[PDB]
Design a protein around this ligand. Structure first.
Ligand SMILES: *[C@@H]1O[C@H](CO)[C@@H](O[C@@H]2O[C@H](CO)[C@@H](O)[C@H](O)[C@H]2NC(C)=O)[C@H](O)[C@H]1NC(C)=O
Ligand SMILES: *[C@@H]1O[C@H](CO)[C@@H](O[C@@H]2O[C@H](CO)[C@@H](O)[C@H](O)[C@H]2NC(C)=O)[C@H](O)[C@H]1NC(C)=O
Ligand SMILES: *[C@@H]1O[C@H](CO)[C@@H](O[C@@H]2O[C@H](CO)[C@@H](O)[C@H](O)[C@H]2NC(C)=O)[C@H](O)[C@H]1NC(C)=O
Ligand SMILES: *[C@@H]1O[C@H](CO)[C@@H](O[C@@H]2O[C@H](CO)[C@@H](O)[C@H](O)[C@H]2NC(C)=O)[C@H](O)[C@H]1NC(C)=O
Ligand SMILES: *[C@@H]1O[C@H](CO)[C@@H](O[C@@H]2O[C@H](CO)[C@@H](O)[C@H](O)[C@H]2NC(C)=O)[C@H](O)[C@H]1NC(C)=O
Ligand SMILES: *[C@@H]1O[C@H](CO)[C@@H](O[C@@H]2O[C@H](CO)[C@@H](O)[C@H](O)[C@H]2NC(C)=O)[C@H](O)[C@H]1NC(C)=O
Lengths: 99, 49, 171, 50
């Protein structure tokens, strides 16, 4: 998990090979590509209480909101199964209204 | 003149060799410290450890 | 010897010690240059901070570069430089990288980590607001991100006070 | 020719307080690195030498 210890990018695995007075490591890693922008909010108000994502991030393509992972675009509908609630939404800065 | 110049030559050569060896030791120490610094820069600035 | 034919002629029969000495010193110098270059040249592009700075209340003025000074160095770097303080066959060679270039690398690293987080260390830099990056960083140490969003102002105040204390301690 | 070296390409990432960037595809990369581990073992006499 330590960054840049074995190759550039997120480390997947490695393979060793011999050399006349040393060793050669082949590092297999993972690199993302083809990004977009979308729009973001930190929490969502509903019925006067604030919801946060269990794991992921809120995005919107312009009209509707979804939850995704942080390393690969895969929208899903926002549900009580993948969000958790904590307190009324009067303190958080950047809250948006949705269902 | 060759005798006295030879005495001076051997003395100065010995001093120079001593200086060079000390420099080599110090350089090795500095290189170790800089390797540690590079590791810290990679692991604590570009990510969370 | 110092510009004497007799001394050089006498020394000529001692072998090739001096070639070895020169080789050792040259190796040391090359190692020094490669060493600093390896430490500081970590990024591939020179990132720049946006002109408008609203990082959720956090204040990075004392570490961001100052366009007023020609050195384009920050406050802390200037405090550091002012605190740290002939020819008989020996010379001093200049370093390959000037101080301006090192300051530029430092600014690039700092802008990249402020704007994109840790994403720019792997592939292409990805934008993200600072508060959400800090929420991720709390989530990474076993504290739910809920905690950050109800204590944003207090956390920002603590961070600013700590930075001020550091600058005062150095000064 | 001689000149002043260029540190690298310069870009300004479009920071904003309500926008992110999420990847939509990936690539897999294999790199190599080389490390020396040993050198030749040598021995030298005295009387045969000096
Ligand atoms: C944002 O995403 C939503 C969800 O897919 C899009 O809404 C759908 O769009 C398709 C394409 O026209 C329609 O067939 C569906 O009926 C829409 N569903 C709903 C619930 O409206 C929306 O078009 C996307 N907006 C943009 C600008 O890309
Ligand atoms: C992100 O920054 C923008 C830029 O100021 C903020 O937009 C302002 O929002 C307030 C309150 O909604 C308005 O009174 C201002 O008129 C807005 N500015 C402009 C230029 O229209 C926005 O609120 C910020 N979003 C956050 C902090 O979540
Ligand atoms: C999200 O929905 C709530 C609930 O309707 C909005 O709160 C109301 O806002 C109106 C318009 O300012 C006020 O007249 C009401 O008094 C508010 N009610 C409560 C209970 O606070 C809220 O404004 C909506 N969010 C946004 C950004 O419009
Ligand atoms: C970030 O902190 C600096 C302090 O280093 C603030 O600079 C101060 O600004 C006020 C008003 O602009 C001046 O009266 C002080 O003299 C400044 N201090 C110094 C040391 O110059 C800066 O304003 C802060 N950032 C923001 C956005 O307020
Ligand atoms: C995301 O949105 C930005 C803002 O509209 C797009 O525009 C880029 O903005 C940056 C900084 O202002 C410039 O350096 C780029 O040249 C702009 N690109 C354009 C105009 O095509 C940006 O393209 C969008 N996409 C991404 C991946 O950032
Ligand atoms: C993700 O990237 C891969 C490779 O960069 C894409 O696969 C290529 O797709 C094009 C058009 O369909 C083909 O002509 C190429 O031969 C494909 N490459 C390989 C190695 O098979 C893939 O389509 C991309 N996926 C998305 C969703 O953008």
């Amino acid at each position: 998990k330590r960054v840049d210890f074995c190759g550039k990018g997120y480390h997947l695995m490695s393979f060793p090979q011999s050399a006349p007075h040393g060793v050669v490591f082949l590092h297999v890693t993972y690199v993302p590509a083809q990004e977009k922008n979308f729009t973001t909010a930190p929490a969502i108000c509903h019925d006067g209480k604030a919801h946060f994502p269990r794991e992921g991030v809120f995005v919107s393509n312009g009209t509707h909101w979804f939850v995704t992972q942080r390393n690969f675009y895969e929208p899903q509908i926002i549900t009580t199964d993948n969000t958790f609630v904590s307190g009324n939404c009067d303190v958080v800065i950047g809250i948006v209204n949705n269902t | 003149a060759e005798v006295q110049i030879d005495r001076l030559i051997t003395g100065r050569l010995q001093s120079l060799q001593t200086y060079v060896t000390q420099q080599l030791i110090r350089a090795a120490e500095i290189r170790a410290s800089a390797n540690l610094a590079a590791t810290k820069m990679s692991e604590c600035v570009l990510g969370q450890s | 010897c110092g510009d004497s034919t007799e001394c050089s002629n006498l020394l000529l029969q001692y072998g090739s010690f001096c070639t070895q000495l020169n080789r050792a010193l040259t190796g040391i110098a090359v190692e020094q240059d490669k060493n600093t270059q390896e430490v500081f040249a970590q990024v591939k592009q020179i990132y720049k901070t946006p002109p408008i700075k609203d990082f959720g209340g956090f204040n990075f003025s004392q570490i961001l570069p100052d366009p007023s000074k020609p050195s384009k160095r920050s406050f802390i770097e200037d405090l550091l430089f002012n605190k740290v303080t002939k020819f008989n066959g020996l010379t001093v060679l200049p370093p390959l990288l000037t101080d301006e270039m090192i300051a530029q690398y430092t600014s690039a690293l700092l802008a990249g980590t402020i704007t994109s987080g840790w994403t720019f260390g792997a592939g292409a830099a990805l934008q993200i607001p600072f508060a959400m990056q800090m929420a991720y960083r709390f989530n990474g140490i076993g504290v739910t991100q809920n905690v950050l969003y109800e204590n944003q102002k207090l956390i920002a105040n603590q961070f600013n006070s700590a930075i001020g204390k550091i600058q005062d301690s150095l000064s | 020719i001689a000149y002043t070296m260029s540190l690298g390409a310069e870009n300004s990432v479009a920071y904003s307080n309500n926008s992110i960037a999420i990847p939509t595809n990936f690539t897999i990369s294999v790199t190599t690195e080389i490390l020396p581990v040993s050198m030749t073992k040598t021995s030298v006499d005295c009387t045969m030498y000096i």
